[PDB]
């Protein structure tokens, strides 16, 4: 008021570091009061000190949230709820926010001009279980594994459970890592784990009686997990002008940062990573580091570190609805198709939409405009699965769900992207997924031993229902070091342009266009550099390919360049081991 900013040092308001008390009910009561006073014009700062603050489920808010690309288990146990609260900055000074149990650490809901700064999010007991191979008898298939120090397990009926505060989970798969390098072991990917038929040798030494894998040599560290992903580390819904400066998420039961329906996002020094060379842990998030579902405006993600995640560093995409019924020339019923992306809005009046022929992944050039959109809900308390959309223009009768499978992309909720000077390494699946028609720069990044392919441009309106016909994308001045040591969906080359197209031989229209790959360095042991399916306009120029033998060549695709349904190729000034490689 008489202050430009009101700054609350948290310690002046009964919230101290290293107290080991439950900070949840306190920060919750305090933010509720600061909000009930501060006007929308009013600028607020919440300030944490050097040290550790522990949050537990007790006294947390219970919100029903629908979160793109996550399990829809409700309610969510929310540690810090920033809801309908503007011009607010949470800052720390090497601050460690430590969570317990199954929680959503930080939720930013329907808030504008929120900045989060110099703060670190972690759980004490990750649902991921770290173990070390002690002995592997390849003949008998007996493996003895050592639980890491922080791990509290429980055997019942010869079954290995990992535990924390109010939770107990049996791991079903894992990722294996090289000792030391923390790389993912060559040709491993997702592997089965011996959590069935087990018995305790000695405390934290577990004998797996039926586990056969010649690759899990003594010393191998294994991140045992399930497929569960009920809550991200930071969830952002319907934000405008959101900032993250020097914020690290070290683990969460879900994605590091999941932002949806949010209009501008600025990230300098974001990390989903380990605490350095001394971190005993090999693993970070249970899913994607950073994920942006149906965002718009400008996304800047720069100078970040992403390591050891159970998925990609960044995935930027929309959701295709599937048309289930045409009511008239102007009105359709359209549906959310996937179990992990439903329950949140899809569009607003005046949004630009285009339609897609799901089976051949072909766009109709005829765009439209949403005139009306209302979710269809049989009971008050039902999640959004189904909309009734009205368009301003009338639909060509070729757009009838009873003739073929038809999808809708919202071209209005598409962000532009700057993804520069980041480091991605030692992570499961791909490095980076980009699915946006809007201009996209991917520059001066380091892809250091990603398990799968460095970059994936992929759309699909049949299985995952994730939009992404790309139209404008420069991948320049990057460094790709020994990518693709392991196979995962779509991992055909270091850079894979792989849309999911059920019927490619009958496709007439190219799905992706305007892709530029210039002045990159590829350090590789294998052959595949670029795979490209359904592209019109593909520039590959001034790139440098440097061979090494750090691992054996193995990929089924033995071609540096593999094109399927690709026109518009421009290919000059490229080299392999300093020798020119020309098309002509």
Author numbering: 34 to 617
What does the paper say about this structure?
The B antigen that is present on red blood cells (RBCs) of type B only differs from the H antigen that defines type O by the terminal galactose unit connected by an α‐1,3‐glycosidic bond to the sub‐terminal galactose. Thus, removal of this additional galactose yields the H antigen of blood type O. For this, we characterized several previously unstudied α‐1,3‐galactosidases belonging to the GH110 family. Our findings revealed that the α‐1,3‐galactosidase from Pedobacter panaciterrae (PpaGal) exhibits superior efficiency compared to previously described galactosidases. Analysis of the structures revealed that the core β‐helix of PpaGal is surrounded by two small β‐barrel domains (domains I and II) as it is typical for enzymes of the GH110 family.
Since crystallization approaches with PpaGal constructs containing a N‐terminal His‐tag were not successful (data not shown), a TEV‐protease‐cleavage site was introduced via site‐directed mutagenesis enabling to remove the His‐tag after purification. Indeed, after His‐tag removal, several crystals were obtained and two structures were solved. The structure of PpaGal in complex with galactose was refined to 2.98 Å resolution, while a resolution of 2.75 Å was obtained for the structure of the non‐complexed apo‐form of PpaGal. Additionally, a stacking geometry via CH‐π‐interaction between the galactose and the tryptophan W497 was found, which often occurs in CAZymes. Interestingly the position of this tryptophan residue shifts if no galactose is bound. Therefore, this specific tryptophan residue which is also highly conserved, seems to have a “gating function” for the substrate. Furthermore, two crystal structures of PpaGal in its galactose free and galactose‐bound state were solved.
